Ligand binder design. Structure first.
Ligand SMILES: Nc1nc2c(ncn2[C@@H]2O[C@H](COP(=O)(O)OP(=O)(O)OP(=O)(O)O)[C@@H](O)[C@H]2O)c(=O)[nH]1
Ligand SMILES: Nc1nc2c(ncn2[C@@H]2O[C@H](COP(=O)(O)OP(=O)(O)OP(=O)(O)O)[C@@H](O)[C@H]2O)c(=O)[nH]1
Ligand SMILES: Nc1nc2c(ncn2[C@@H]2O[C@H](COP(=O)(O)OP(=O)(O)OP(=O)(O)O)[C@@H](O)[C@H]2O)c(=O)[nH]1
Ligand SMILES: Nc1nc2c(ncn2[C@@H]2O[C@H](COP(=O)(O)OP(=O)(O)OP(=O)(O)O)[C@@H](O)[C@H]2O)c(=O)[nH]1
Ligand SMILES: [Mg+2]
Ligand SMILES: [Mg+2]
Ligand SMILES: [Mg+2]
Ligand SMILES: [Mg+2]
Lengths: 372, 177, 372, 177, 177, 177
């Protein structure tokens, strides 16, 4: 039981910690090499949903989240942007825990309507890619025309716009996209008060922490990090994969079409740029017309992000005093454990007909009670 | 010395262990740990007789469903608990708990018990419930459910402040006769 | 403490045997005082359902049942009839285990049709009780005529039959009863081959065992014992409570009416009497017209019970030789138990700022390596 | 005239049917045949008044629990039985029986009834209880249970010797009156 | 030394542990014990290369639903097992197992595996299945399910006789490349 | 003319986007902005032949897995990338990437592509990997994985110094031919 004893101890510790000290399990998860923390994420998050179902424990989770994020910042963050490039597992857990805690219907109770609107439009086909549109045109419409495609099949980007027809589909798509996108953006911007306190609070801790370590960081830079958490990390994935993050219930039938993907995906691209204050250009020049929209959307996003941090400390948010001024007790904890059986040497098993495993028969008298 | 067996069942994290510890030590558990099972004992005398009040705590998590029924034999009264500030726990009272105890102990009387009543006026929990378009369960709603589910009656309390805490067990004791 | 451990240890033993040695747990259950074995019946049976899902294991359970039943007989049975009045717990387990084992749909796939017929007849109202019928007659149907019950509201049997009207309802009920009963009876008698092997085998063991100890017992006495197991104990309860023994799916709505209960119950009474060769009389004289049917039905039951025991030994029934002529091994066993935490004070923990917890690193490496 | 509904319940094989037969027909049933449900009628004088006592015999086995209540509606007095030479049966008085009839008939009086007392004074039987380390229940042990369970008063008898038999139903009617 | 991770999942008691143990040691488990978790290692060379075949046994019982997935990361091929003489296990292949592994490992291939094929001609199991109006699952039916569930293919064996046992892992290896 | 579909995939922040920009526009993107999906067009000569290489840039973060396959249909060659100064990224090549593309595109060739090589020969960075006990991946370490995962051939570069950049897409086109 060399390799076997390890595995046993692993599960033993794991299920011991899960039941009795998930906060500490979480902490151990944070300091593990990042690739390895992946296998524990779901199972710990699941347990935290139950653990943090009352404000005193949710308070502790918030403090755990806080000290770990700060621990991460002043220890692995050297030039800002590190809290983003580094992919801290604390942020990954903060993001997940807030998706399906128990206010549950938060992202679906906020993006489902408008997402259901984009998925349902059986005609919508946004496509900001010329070459793709080009190839999709007569290169695919000359089907009910014959001559196959007397044109130069597979062309570049600059010349796909030679054909005004192709420059038109793009024109429309750009119109469609901006319409659909504004619907999404308004659902989000108008519903800041629907975001989870906990998520808002970490965004605050996040910002106040980077800023404490990097005073030379501007409101603009800070809010781009805060936006990374709230938008690109938290809700953007739900917009692109509503079927994966359960935004729209998937009744046994069919999954999202490539068209529906390309649609939702295009909205995310547009909004990412807006939140990250990045105008279209160089190779993305054909979408430059939106640069005006992007700059207004950013200004809205910016305001949003800044307000997200506007929130009290957990000590205040939950009147933690109803807890801290109490006379507590810590009675001994009983937990469910995994056990191994020693295993009798073959030498004694070969002769169990003569020897014979020991057995407590006066046990049925003990068993005959339990709970009196 | 006659004994009275009282078993507490209800959704996980609703306050079953807290109310029991708070009532028997007058202290508040310092932390939360989902229970597997446990049972304490306390002596009382509502009738000049020294009765032993056996208090049995059970697991609320479904993960522990198979084990839970082991605490049900010879039970005199059940305390079906739910959090007045947690709607879901209130619904499981009829969707899970009452059905379970009536399956194992059809003849045994039980009380519907609201817990965590001190959070009804807590700002954050009220706001949290509103963001979900919900509100704390009202005594009237629970008292109705009690009648429908044929509970001896409804009672609520706060393990934290102990408001109503003793009355809960006084009734339990009364119903155990 | 030294008290909660003796208990905690009795619980750990229960969990261990449940997963590692249910056969032995079952045996311990058989020797406990009877009132005390009731709290383990369901949970052990539930485990045995999975444990005996394969023939080799079901074989061992059969041998367990056998030796325990013979143990019971030659040890607590002094005048026959004792295997019945003694309510042996082995028989209780034998009966339950055969109700919801793995062939599940056995009683419901045999009684449901005719029971569903007696339940569905919204007009069927059998009642073999004169005073109850009498009091139900004008003593109740006059709620739509007025003049109240100008008659002796509450009379005796003999005089309840004074009113030819009441004597008639009874007459019909006896007709209805005999009709529904025959339907039930035929389902049972024509389907002997659908009974579970294990149940038939224990009936065989049971019979051959009582006969071995009481050679002076007659075929008739022996078969009444066997009929007690197969009929009164095994299926009669499912006829009387199809809602309780899952013979009929109970869709959220309403439970059996008192009339449906009294109907099913009446069938059970007639069939009990037949199976036990007991004619109606003395106080049950008003049902004596059924004594001819009862005696024919008994003859059918008697033939049924005798054939029930007509079955091979388990060694032959399952070619157990396929498991004896074989090279076996016993790998290590892992199981789920309970454990209480000591709760000791940590000297170093308060000083993690100065000493860097070597525990967090070990525990993280350990957890981190889970799997491969 | 005057009818009294008296329902006899209790562990199977304790002798419920035999006491009802040797009482109403002064005959002791040879063999054992568990019952499903039966009825007996006997008019007896109490306080110089003619009363018709309705005797409802029921099934003791647990597998017939859904059926038993069918005999409970409008019962005057319940006769909870147990065999004095069978502790098991005695334990169930406060374990199952008293709890069941109390659920279905809250304000209904009942008496505790010991049976087979003629076997209590029998060696071959006592030696059987010894080989399992058990002792025949005693009038004192019982009477205590009666008062504890809030019975009307313990009584006992023998269906075989009819000893104390008659007095049982007399106390029964008195209780129903 | 390149490694191949093969994980076996399927209903409790269908034969997962026995086929693994029989394949790696040519012995047969003497008794049945539901497994919690277990993993062995064996070396093979279908390509002149010394590969390490990591075999992971998992718990079939639902109680371990939360613990089982911890064996899933880095899996190269799954073996979804069902007993050919147990229709209910066959149905759970599509109601539970394939869904579960494809939720945790969408890209990982898996083979459908029928077990206990030696019982297809065992008298008592055929009779047992007939009383329930059932018959052993036929290769044709299983092969269909594999096509519908998009399994690499269907294979069956007997851990008892070893008929087909090696081919099961030969294909697993083949599919894990 | 002639178009080649080359899809770039791999852990987020490894520099997938940067290599695509400083190559097609010989400019190194200042700030970091994770991508959703992009497209690049560059015609280059290979064997004295003009080819139009279609560059599909994708999302690295796991939360965008449902979306990434949208770029996989009809791809000529895949570019699995990773940071040579981030073991984490390297581990995921044989852990996630290679396995994903092999599910969607079984018979499609791919190359292994190291990146940010300019940081490997950097102290301030190596001292960071040291404070976590890690060492920058090496050409040998990589090339081994390349052959193990049945790649076409390892290659590396730097988006900042453009070193080896050009050679990457050359081998790529060569692989698609
Ligand atoms: N404010 C307030 N919080 C309470 C009260 N009772 C419990 N809580 C909170 O709820 C948490 C969980 O309560 P417990 O009683 O441990 O949960 P439980 O009912 O035992 O749940 P399980 O053991 O998993 O079945 C406690 O740790 C407190 O944080 C109360 O009366 N007032
Ligand atoms: N020696 C003796 N045996 C008795 C006495 N009363 C009952 N018995 C025996 O106990 C066994 C069962 O008696 P029953 O009256 O049929 O038992 P029951 O209470 O009707 O049981 P169920 O109908 O199954 O609920 C038979 O052997 C009876 O003869 C008694 O007073 N003395
Ligand atoms: N005849 C026959 N019996 C088998 C075969 N395989 C397993 N069995 C029987 O089925 C029993 C249980 O098989 P296991 O492999 O232990 O069950 P499992 O799949 O591991 O189930 P869990 O560990 O509880 O998830 C074995 O003990 C044997 O009695 C087989 O190939 N042929
Ligand atoms: N010093 C240095 N930094 C680089 C180099 N290449 C990329 N980076 C930096 O790595 C960070 C992220 O680069 P990206 O190209 O956006 O990473 P990516 O693979 O596109 O990540 P996603 O698009 O989110 O999947 C930024 O700081 C880049 O400037 C390099 O060669 N040298
Ligand atoms: Mg609790
Ligand atoms: Mg009777
Ligand atoms: Mg197994
Ligand atoms: Mg990118």
């Amino acid at each position: 039981s060399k390799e076997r004893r390890k595995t046993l101890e692993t599960y033993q510790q794991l299920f011991y910690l899960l039941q009795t000290n998930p906060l500490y399990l979480a902490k151990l998860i944070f300091q593990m090499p990042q690739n390895k923390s992946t296998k524990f994420m779901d199972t710990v998050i699941f347990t935290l949903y139950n653990y943090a179902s009352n404000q005193r424990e949710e308070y502790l989770l918030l403090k755990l989240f806080k000290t770990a994020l700060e621990e991460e910042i002043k220890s692995k963050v050297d030039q800002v942007q590190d809290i983003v490039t580094g992919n801290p597992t604390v942020i990954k857990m903060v993001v997940s825990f807030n998706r399906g805690a128990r206010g549950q219907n938060t992202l679906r109770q906020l993006l489902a309507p408008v997402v259901k609107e984009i998925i349902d439009d059986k005609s919508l086909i946004i496509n900001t890619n010329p070459v793709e549109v080009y190839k999709a045109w007569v290169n695919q419409l000359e089907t009910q025309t014959g001559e196959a495609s007397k044109l130069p099949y597979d062309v570049t980007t600059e010349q796909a716009l030679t054909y005004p027809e192709v420059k038109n589909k793009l024109e429309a798509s750009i119109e469609n996209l901006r319409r659909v996108t504004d619907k999404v953006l308004n659902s989000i911007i108008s519903s800041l008060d629907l975001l989870p306190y906990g998520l808002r609070y970490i965004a605050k801790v996040l910002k106040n922490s980077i800023h404490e370590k990097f005073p030379d960081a501007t409101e603009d830079e800070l809010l781009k990090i805060v936006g990374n958490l709230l938008y690109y990390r938290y809700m953007n994935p739900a917009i692109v994969a509503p079927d994966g993050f359960d935004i729209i219930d998937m009744t046994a039938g069919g999954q999202i079409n490539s068209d529906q993907r390309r649609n939702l995906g295009s909205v995310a691209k547009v909004l990412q740029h807006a939140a990250s204050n990045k105008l279209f250009e160089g190779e993305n020049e054909h979408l430059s017309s939106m640069n005006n929209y992007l700059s207004e959307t950013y200004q809205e996003f910016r305001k949003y992000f800044k307000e997200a941090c506007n929130v009290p400390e957990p000590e205040e948010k939950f009147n933690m005093d109803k807890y801290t001024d109490l006379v507590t007790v810590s009675k001994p904890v009983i937990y469910i454990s995994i056990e191994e059986i020693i295993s009798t040497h073959s030498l004694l098993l070969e002769h169990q007909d003569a020897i014979a495993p020991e057995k407590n028969d006066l046990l049925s008298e003990l068993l005959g009670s339990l709970g009196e | 010395m006659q004994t009275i067996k009282c078993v507490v069942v209800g959704d996980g994290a609703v306050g079953k262990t807290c109310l029991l510890i708070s009532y028997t030590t007058n202290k508040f558990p310092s932390e939360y740990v989902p229970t597997v099972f446990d049972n304490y004992a306390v002596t009382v005398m509502i009738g000049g007789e020294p009765y032993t009040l056996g208090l049995f705590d059970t697991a609320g998590l479904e993960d522990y469903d198979r084990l839970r029924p082991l605490s049900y034999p010879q039970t005199d009264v059940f305390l079906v608990c739910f959090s007045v500030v947690s709607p879901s726990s209130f619904e499981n009272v009829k969707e899970k708990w009452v059905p379970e105890i009536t399956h194992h102990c059809p003849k045994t009387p039980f009380l519907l018990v609201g817990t965590q009543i001190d959070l009804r006026d807590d700002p954050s929990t009220i706001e949290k419930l509103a963001k979900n378009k919900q509100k704390p369960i009202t005594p009237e709603t629970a008292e109705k459910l009690a009648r429908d589910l044929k509970a001896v009656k409804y009672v609520e309390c706060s393990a934290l402040t102990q408001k109503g805490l003793k009355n809960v067990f006084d009734e339990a004791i009364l119903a155990a006769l």
